[PDB]
């Protein structure tokens, strides 16, 4: 952060701060050139692939900053333009996982976006390490919080969605609908199971049933997929809380 003995200091946190802006403005430009587009192509997901990896590495950078509570280097990220770049990644975050989740072949690149975001939550708890009572981080992350409402709020919707899914595979009412340990089970009872459940509205039951692929037996493994959900949401969403 301040090279002291030195006669010209070099602010690097700032500099990486810049980078990270600049790569999630990138990101953001080319999901918007992907959000119309009903599949994203493979070179579409490899250009993705790599830059979630950069900034994974770019987050990972800061995190290493600023933990080890570094109070300088948590008020220097304070003050960058570290904010706007967190409420890009919360509005790319909030519209690609429901645009991904419902598409089959796109499972790879939800899962390096999911770990994009667990990261991220991750830098914003090594920012908030060492807090105050009414201390000027807090200040700035609620102010952040407030302009990425919406998002935040389609996020959490998505983590309640997909961990309430646990609690209806593990209900009695669904291991009658399966009584045998075959794990598998057909279309039309899922969505009579879920309807029973009561928990899940009809608009989350809908999306559940296209974020679910089934095969030409129209029967599709449940394990597989609270396996492929209900975890990151479980991972990323304890951070959040």
């Known amino acids: ?76 990220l304070a003050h960058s333009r570290l904010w706007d770049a967190v409420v890009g990644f919360l509005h790319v975050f909030a519209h690609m996982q429901m645009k991904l989740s419902q598409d089959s072949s796109q499972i790879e690149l939800l899962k390096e976006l999911m770990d994009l975001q667990k990261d991220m939550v991750v830098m914003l708890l090594s920012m908030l390490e060492g807090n105050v009572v009414n201390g000027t981080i807090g200040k700035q992350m609620v102010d952040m919080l407030v302009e990425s409402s919406n998002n935040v709020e389609m996020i959490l919707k998505f983590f309640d969605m997909f961990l309430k899914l646990k609690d209806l595979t593990s209900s009695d009412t669904f291991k009658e609908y399966d009584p045998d340990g075959k794990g598998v089970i057909s279309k039309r009872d899922f969505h009579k199971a879920m309807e029973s459940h009561k928990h899940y509205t009809q608009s989350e039951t809908e999306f559940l049933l296209s974020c679910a692929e089934t095969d030409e037996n129209e029967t599709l493994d449940y394990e597989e997929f609270v396996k492929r959900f209900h975890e990151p949401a479980k991972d990323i969403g304890f951070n959040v809380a």
């Open 1 to 76: 952060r301040t090279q002291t003995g030195n006669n010209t200091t070099v602010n690097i946190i700032i500099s990486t701060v810049d980078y990270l802006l600049r790569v999630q403005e990138s990101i953001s430009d080319f999901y918007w050139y992907y959000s119309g587009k009903d599949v994203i192509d493979e070179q579409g997901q490899r250009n993705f692939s790599k830059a979630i990896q950069v900034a994974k590495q770019v987050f990972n950078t800061l995190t290493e900053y600023i933990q080890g509570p570094c109070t300088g280097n948590q008020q220097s």
